[PDB]
Design a protein around this ligand. Structure first.
Ligand SMILES: *[C@@H]1O[C@H](CO)[C@@H](O[C@@H]2O[C@H](CO)[C@@H](O)[C@H](O)[C@H]2NC(C)=O)[C@H](O)[C@H]1NC(C)=O
Ligand SMILES: *[C@@H]1O[C@H](CO)[C@@H](O[C@@H]2O[C@H](CO)[C@@H](O)[C@H](O)[C@H]2NC(C)=O)[C@H](O)[C@H]1NC(C)=O
Ligand SMILES: *[C@@H]1O[C@H](CO)[C@@H](O[C@@H]2O[C@H](CO)[C@@H](O)[C@H](O)[C@H]2NC(C)=O)[C@H](O)[C@H]1NC(C)=O
Ligand SMILES: *[C@@H]1O[C@H](CO)[C@@H](O)[C@H](O)[C@H]1NC(C)=O
Ligand SMILES: *[C@@H]1O[C@H](CO)[C@@H](O)[C@H](O)[C@H]1NC(C)=O
Ligand SMILES: *[C@@H]1O[C@H](CO)[C@@H](O)[C@H](O)[C@H]1NC(C)=O
Lengths: 337, 337, 337
């Protein structure tokens, strides 16, 4: 992580990341069964286990509608079965509950569709070099969050669904992020604003550079950006001379000339850009002293650790997160009997 | 709420909203610990409580993989423990269940990570004036949704996670929404369409106006828009003369000249725009009478309460939501024995 | 499904789909009430049912904060109530659980807010012709997903919420998808790239064509695209001569001329586009033999069934999903006593 301030265009580039990109989809098929329940002597009467079985049977029947392939007297013994049924058959119930809640597909691969043991084995079988496989196992919280389970169908008392794990093929390719703010000059009152429109992520692969334009498109897990190959716009590798020289007469860079000053604050990974002109007062302050200085009229770059808040005409911006309070909560004890 | 129809460009502007913008992030750290279970004689022999404990231990162990800090016989007394364990330790299990379901992070702050009592106290401690704090307490429903919990790690039988509440610094700043439709003139069979491209929200703050271009970006809660400061494009405060005069020779407004007529319907907050030319028949009708009139060839604005359905060549559009049926459902009674 | 390769612009169009568009919103109001529990003698002394009731009361009280209307010893008989209470009042608890988890609104209509019997009846009452109603019943999986429940408020022991089902008015209107890749010509070492910008979905309705520009906007369910009428950009029906002839002097097609070659792979529904120039070696290989051939320098279209992997300078792309392993899992049996 190393953020550089470019004063000729009022923008910053942070080049310390490594890119991991998806290059296909894996697939596993699961079949979860309810499990045998010992026969009841009565077989026709209201019992806690029978009511529990009926609810499970009814839940499966309703769940069959949201599919993809085909459709679209108290006794001590009874209590033990009712509790035992919901304990031994817990993974099955959770899968049924999750699919019903999301109505067909879960947003992410929870730890009930595919346990860790099944996840590690699946990753090791993917068609990628050893380098990619090692990285995926190191941080498997992202493969789960990038996949999505799909319900195939329901037959009898079993459930069939697909996981569709992601597959990463390009890893450890250096890349950066670019943030820009307006840079308006002035002669006698008539301004000339130049704002760079090539703002967002920027990562390289396969002899080309991708341009995920939304900061939310690519997640961050330290020195790793888990970009999704669904919004990236491929651009020529020559689209880097803009940083060195905005014009450079070589690669036309996307800029938007203006005529009216704009005052705004843009937050960077390790700082923020403060630009304000002609009317609004700017100042940088911390949680200790809020009178550090008044920013001069222009585009100024302030480090994250140098200041904590920037007030653009009575509007704090909180460069960095603010820590609150820590709580510790413990449940009540479960005494015998 | 007051919608105005501008006939020189076939667009409408609604000026009745108040803006609420985010200016940072808060943070709280929680540590939920499982309750204490009294020593059980004959730990070797299975029991309905040992099985429940084993499932909890297994669930926590799997949950450790998706983290961020380090990784990535039955007696009457026995039954009470199984029921009691899941009752006293209800908050802990729900937090474990939610994190496992979403695989590491919960999309919103449910009412198990942070109860109302904890949420109210945290909001009162934020670094914002009394005005902002009062508003957040008044409607805390749109605080949990904008936030998101993060699982830090799992150690022993305890779970550590972060909430990261949002912080609002700019409130009660009036703003509006602009919707536009094509306005094509006819000249001896030759058309000239002019469709505005500055369509979306438009809110003001810190001597500038933001331009969230997607209606889904900002969520409305009456006379309040909880816009997210992640897609807003800052624009000059002079970007308002377009409504008064499309050209105005002052702020170049984004328009897209065309040559072929386009027939479409745009739904405004309190009405809709109906444009249809050269071939498709327009008509406005209600659920009572559907022959109110036939709209003339051109851009026309119809109030929400004036009509309910707009048919563009046999395609009803349902200006406003249609109410269905109300159901009342009660669960079966529970009787002793 | 029929994919055509257009060599004059290095793009492909697939014309085999049928459109399904939303034209309003439906609405149902539900009121779920907790069941009646027979009064238990000695309410003062704790019991496994009183604790269960207290948790339910506490859960409802907290849920009241996230609303929209107003705010923002153990015996054998006792155990049966605790188990029976959570069985009969299963739908109510699930609705409470879902609303609390999502903090006010559920992303989709799970199978606890509206059962299939209620959903089928509601769909039959929508104000649409018999043709639209028949389609919605046939595949109701993509009705719950497009809808979303809303919690109105909590009064006493009852819960009131709204479902807001979607309504489809335009069906069986043929439409297609267009994917394009750079087509750079070489002239004495000087390149001239032409990449189409009219990339995405393209569906027709009401004498106009919509242009959902994101592949994720429209979800495919076979020969049906359930596009959401929230991002569609209406375009003239004459915006189709681009495929036949790029210029055609009638509808200016959106292209972006360039000067530097770009190498990339675009995945079409039934194939992919491979373009690579001046430095990176292309090759197509299957899971059987990976030396099928080396693609020549240019824009080439390869069928999905012809090859499985595309390597752009040591980067496999996995044209089609790769099948993994199938698991069958059964829960432990439950035996009496
Ligand atoms: C950035 O690029 C501009 C554009 O080419 C450079 O300005 C040119 O510099 C050359 C000298 O190498 C002159 O012959 C041209 O007349 C200049 N043109 C213009 C429009 O200024 C500039 O030198 C480059 N470097 C910097 C720091 O701006
Ligand atoms: C909107 O702006 C246009 C452009 O400035 C105005 O049209 C001009 O009006 C002045 C009179 O003040 C004339 O001297 C110019 O010749 C006009 N130019 C053009 C291109 O029309 C227009 O009057 C303004 N008002 C309205 C309602 O359009
Ligand atoms: C595609 O459109 C272009 C543009 O009109 C056509 O090129 C023209 O063809 C006419 C013949 O009908 C000539 O008189 C013009 O001089 C051509 N103009 C240019 C710029 O080439 C072209 O023939 C059409 N068809 C194809 C296959 O490109
Ligand atoms: C239980 O009884 C049913 C009654 O039809 C029978 O089919 C089944 O084989 C018996 N055993 C189990 C384990 O369900
Ligand atoms: C059981 O007793 C032992 C005695 O050392 C103690 O270490 C252990 O924590 C106890 N277990 C429970 C569940 O109370
Ligand atoms: C139970 O007793 C209460 C008195 O506290 C009474 O209000 C209620 O009607 C009785 N019946 C119930 C709870 O079913």
């Amino acid at each position: 992580l190393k953020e550089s301030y470019l004063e000729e265009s009022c923008s910053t580039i942070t080049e310390g990341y490594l890119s991991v990109l998806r290059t296909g989809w894996y697939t596993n098929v699961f079949t979860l069964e309810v499990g045998d329940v010992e026969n009841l002597t009565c077989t026709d009467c209201p019992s806690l286990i029978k009511t529990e079985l009926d609810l499970t049977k009814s839940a499966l029947r309703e769940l069959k509608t949201v599919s993809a392939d085909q459709l679209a007297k108290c006794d001590i013994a009874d209590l033990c079965m009712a509790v035992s049924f919901s304990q031994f058959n817990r993974r099955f119930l959770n899968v049924v509950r999750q699919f019903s809640d999301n109505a067909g597909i879960t947003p992410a691969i929870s730890l009930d569709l595919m346990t860790d043991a099944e996840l590690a084995r699946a990753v090791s079988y993917m068609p990628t070099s050893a380098g990619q496989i090692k990285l995926m196992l190191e941080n498997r919280a992202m493969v789960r969050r990038k996949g999505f389970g799909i319900l195939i169908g329901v037959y009898g008392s079993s459930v069939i669904y697909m996981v569709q794990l992601p597959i990463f093929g390009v890893i450890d390719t250096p890349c950066w992020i670019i943030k820009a703010a307006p840079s308006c000059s002035e002669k006698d009152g008539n301004y000339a604003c130049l704002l760079r429109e090539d703002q967002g992520w920027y990562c390289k692969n396969a002899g080309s550079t991708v341009y995920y334009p939304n900061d939310k498109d690519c997640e961050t897990r330290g020195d790793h950006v888990f970009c999704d190959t669904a919004a990236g716009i491929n651009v020529a590798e020559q689209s880097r001379e803009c940083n060195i020289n905005i014009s450079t007469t070589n690669y036309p860079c996307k800029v938007s000339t203006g005529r009216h000053p704009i005052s705004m604050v843009a937050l960077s990974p390790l700082g923020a850009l403060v630009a304000c002109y002609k009317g609004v007062s700017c100042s940088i302050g911390s949680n200790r002293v809020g009178i550090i200085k008044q920013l001069p009229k222009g585009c100024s770059y302030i480090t994250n650790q140098d200041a904590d808040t920037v007030t653009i005409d009575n509007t704090v911006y909180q460069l960095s997160k603010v820590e609150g309070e820590q709580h510790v909560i413990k449940g009540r004890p479960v005494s015998s009997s």
